[PDB]
């Protein structure tokens, strides 16, 4: 069998020979009890670069040792590329959302042998779920593997927007001081109203982290959390996005991309937010209308916007989120920290082992299986 | 009486005509129960720029209503400055740590009428305390007014260093994507060992905010906290800084500048930290040896440094912290967010109202009074 694995390029300075620290903390389990991934073995040391071409997610010796062939490449765009050329032979396709091999219906129609599409990470919107259901393709992702990582990125970006971190760092590099230029748009987060769209693995983790900042917490999702959980964190639930955003100084989006959330934050919804509200989006790019975000930033309806997710990915050189005012963007990185890579690489291997040993894949990893949304997919997604 | 007040310049784009938001949250008290400042009146709306020359800390109408004069300038360095020229006459001198009117022994000795030195903010190391003591000068500061603001900046900076926020932002601006370049030094904070030097108003607030990030917490002070709080936040006490930093992935400094902390983090102490440790200093610049920090970053002993405090202030154009590798600096801004300004501006007025009506200044505002360290000064400072 042939496994088709798309990963991002090595660093332009070469694949690293050393690292800033000697190791990473050992993460045994996640909040709520889900165990860390359980592959029989890992062919890497946590802390190493696994998500790039040279890292191979630590998969080669395990796969080739079973008699399979593994194609690793970063070349994912075009019909004469390595990905789309190898696709008709692939039984298994793997890729990361940070450098996603888009599985369109046209590409799935060509992938005659494809049975398993693995998201090395969290979030399978780059796969056409409707077409995968149609063709009997199983879709899995490493649920929870980088949820905590993203929640850290969120609190970081909220604080950077509100406190005006990045323009202030820029005065340091320009040789200035310019206190009044830094702080004429610098506020404390303390006692602001913060609301999250979704209170799942990331959302709940953001709410727990936000709590000791003494903010007023808000959340909107289709199903409420346990009342006991709400009272312990001081949460107000809202039946609609609209009802939540109208009283929020800061909004975080932590929902998956599916028809319920596509183009959710458009001109209309953003106009219902508070004047000068801050918007953070580490979820998926297309949940916010690209031009509606730019446009509320230029007017001041949004005081700032930040996130790591774009559409498409990679973002083109002229993508307007690069140049819109008052942003604190990164490329899609929060879920591919070295710490997180250790977890979703182990989880990717666990899924493969389950596939090739004809053991069932963890129910929480599943998105679609047997021609339907299944597992976490039926809980979090819509088609 | 004459009040001489030193403030930073208005923005180079002009004193703002509008703000990103309509108001800021009203802060009633601080954690632990200390009330917010209690002036009889304020002549500003919270959220306005008060710490620049045009803001005047909202003091002019009040002071001139009583027949006093108020002289305001930013020109503060050297014997040939508006500040030094106006000083021999002043009964009261006010400045902010972010743009500090340094009250050396020489300047204090020439201030023939000086009886009160107020810090519009927190931290009175810019006043020579021994000379104030000897000359019978009251030194006061608005205790707690921006402690929470700094605790926010700290967590922002820890996350930025560890997750590698700023270089990844620059890849966005350069038109790139470059995941592996961003994340070859990107880590999660989760389960790292983090310790603070001091667990005071800032340091405790830092520890409370870091706890739900699931770090292992450490601290060092001169006075150990009781069991109740050490057990409630999972704190490990260390009897010295040396003992703390050798087990810490991340170190925060949150003590005042006095002889017990001057040059604390020198080459020798920094060399006992873990290889690849991250160092955050929102406390005072001189607590870290300027060149030792540069050396440790150039050698990889420190994986990152970040803070907002420099020496001297303003830092000159060629100050090596602007250009050392792997920094996430800002100018001195954390304690002068618009929200923090409302509090210490109200606190400056409360102190002046107490001065002129011969009411006692809040003991906790006091640093030196009656020829000795007093109030908070005796709790936190040494001479
Ligand atoms: N590097 C990154 O930036 C990064 C990394 C990982 C994940 N992500 C994104 O973040 C998504 C979620 O992460 P996760 O680990 O927290 O997954 P999760 O644990 O399954 O949580 C998803 C939550 O979205 C809720 N929600 C679903 N549909 C909604 C809707 N139409 N409106 C409002 N809320 C809705 C769901 O709750 P209800 O059923 O009650 O509505 C669920 O609680 C992922 O799918 C991925 O797209 C980004
Ligand atoms: N904008 C800014 O960046 C900003 C704003 C405000 C303040 N600051 C700086 O941060 C300092 C602290 O702020 P704060 O609000 O937390 O004042 P604070 O409530 O008095 O806290 C002072 C803490 O320093 C401790 N400490 C004192 N001497 C020490 C020593 N020799 N070694 C180790 N720890 C020592 C004290 O604990 P022990 O007595 O037990 O040792 C105390 O917990 C301020 O003095 C100021 O310089 C910066």
UniProtKB/TrEMBL annotation, chains A, B:
<feature type="site" description="Important for catalytic activity">
    <location>
        <position position="284"/>
    </location>
</feature>
<feature type="binding site">
    <location>
        <position position="308"/>
    </location>
    <ligand>
        <name>NAD(+)</name>
    </ligand>
</feature>
<dbReference type="GO" id="GO:0008863">
    <property type="term" value="F:formate dehydrogenase (NAD+) activity"/>
</dbReference>
<dbReference type="Pfam" id="PF02826">
    <property type="entry name" value="2-Hacid_dh_C"/>
</dbReference>
<feature type="binding site">
    <location>
        <position position="223"/>
    </location>
    <ligand>
        <name>NADP(+) 1</name>
    </ligand>
</feature>
<feature type="domain" description="D-isomer specific 2-hydroxyacid dehydrogenase NAD-binding">
    <location>
        <begin position="155"/>
        <end position="334"/>
    </location>
</feature>
<feature type="binding site">
    <location>
        <position position="380"/>
    </location>
    <ligand>
        <name>NAD(+)</name>
    </ligand>
</feature>
<dbReference type="GO" id="GO:0051287">
    <property type="term" value="F:NAD binding"/>
</dbReference>
<dbReference type="GO" id="GO:0016616">
    <property type="term" value="F:oxidoreductase activity, acting on the CH-OH group of donors, NAD or NADP as acceptor"/>
</dbReference>
<feature type="binding site">
    <location>
        <position position="332"/>
    </location>
    <ligand>
        <name>NADP(+) 1</name>
    </ligand>
</feature>
<keyword id="KW-0520">NAD</keyword>
<comment type="similarity">
    <text>Belongs to the D-isomer specific 2-hydroxyacid dehydrogenase family. FDH subfamily.</text>
</comment>
<feature type="binding site">
    <location>
        <position position="258"/>
    </location>
    <ligand>
        <name>NADP(+) 1</name>
    </ligand>
</feature>
<comment type="function">
    <text>Catalyzes the NAD(+)-dependent oxidation of formate to carbon dioxide. Formate oxidation is the final step in the methanol oxidation pathway in methylotrophic microorganisms. Has a role in the detoxification of exogenous formate in non-methylotrophic organisms.</text>
</comment>
<feature type="binding site">
    <location>
        <begin position="332"/>
        <end position="335"/>
    </location>
    <ligand>
        <name>NAD(+)</name>
    </ligand>
</feature>
<feature type="binding site">
    <location>
        <begin position="201"/>
        <end position="202"/>
    </location>
    <ligand>
        <name>NAD(+)</name>
    </ligand>
</feature>
<feature type="binding site">
    <location>
        <position position="258"/>
    </location>
    <ligand>
        <name>NAD(+)</name>
    </ligand>
</feature>
<feature type="binding site">
    <location>
        <position position="260"/>
    </location>
    <ligand>
        <name>NADP(+) 1</name>
    </ligand>
</feature>
<dbReference type="GO" id="GO:0042183">
    <property type="term" value="P:formate catabolic process"/>
</dbReference>
<feature type="binding site">
    <location>
        <position position="283"/>
    </location>
    <ligand>
        <name>NAD(+)</name>
    </ligand>
</feature>
<keyword id="KW-0560">Oxidoreductase</keyword>
<feature type="binding site">
    <location>
        <position position="334"/>
    </location>
    <ligand>
        <name>NADP(+) 1</name>
    </ligand>
</feature>
<feature type="binding site">
    <location>
        <position position="201"/>
    </location>
    <ligand>
        <name>NADP(+) 2</name>
    </ligand>
</feature>
<feature type="binding site">
    <location>
        <position position="380"/>
    </location>
    <ligand>
        <name>NADP(+) 1</name>
    </ligand>
</feature>
<feature type="binding site">
    <location>
        <position position="147"/>
    </location>
    <ligand>
        <name>NADP(+) 1</name>
    </ligand>
</feature>
<feature type="binding site">
    <location>
        <position position="201"/>
    </location>
    <ligand>
        <name>NAD(+)</name>
    </ligand>
</feature>
<feature type="domain" description="D-isomer specific 2-hydroxyacid dehydrogenase catalytic">
    <location>
        <begin position="71"/>
        <end position="358"/>
    </location>
</feature>
<feature type="binding site">
    <location>
        <begin position="256"/>
        <end position="260"/>
    </location>
    <ligand>
        <name>NAD(+)</name>
    </ligand>
</feature>
<feature type="binding site">
    <location>
        <position position="202"/>
    </location>
    <ligand>
        <name>NAD(+)</name>
    </ligand>
</feature>
<feature type="binding site">
    <location>
        <position position="283"/>
    </location>
    <ligand>
        <name>NADP(+) 1</name>
    </ligand>
</feature>
<feature type="binding site">
    <location>
        <position position="202"/>
    </location>
    <ligand>
        <name>NADP(+) 2</name>
    </ligand>
</feature>
<feature type="site" description="Important for catalytic activity">
    <location>
        <position position="332"/>
    </location>
</feature>
<dbReference type="GO" id="GO:0005737">
    <property type="term" value="C:cytoplasm"/>
</dbReference>
<feature type="binding site">
    <location>
        <position position="282"/>
    </location>
    <ligand>
        <name>NAD(+)</name>
    </ligand>
</feature>
<comment type="subunit">
    <text>Homodimer.</text>
</comment>
<feature type="binding site">
    <location>
        <position position="122"/>
    </location>
    <ligand>
        <name>substrate</name>
    </ligand>
</feature>
<dbReference type="Pfam" id="PF00389">
    <property type="entry name" value="2-Hacid_dh"/>
</dbReference>
<feature type="binding site">
    <location>
        <position position="334"/>
    </location>
    <ligand>
        <name>NAD(+)</name>
    </ligand>
</feature>
<feature type="binding site">
    <location>
        <position position="147"/>
    </location>
    <ligand>
        <name>NADP(+) 2</name>
    </ligand>
</feature>
<dbReference type="InterPro" id="IPR006139">
    <property type="entry name" value="D-isomer_2_OHA_DH_cat_dom"/>
</dbReference>
<feature type="binding site">
    <location>
        <position position="146"/>
    </location>
    <ligand>
        <name>substrate</name>
    </ligand>
</feature>
<dbReference type="InterPro" id="IPR033689">
    <property type="entry name" value="FDH_NAD-dep"/>
</dbReference>
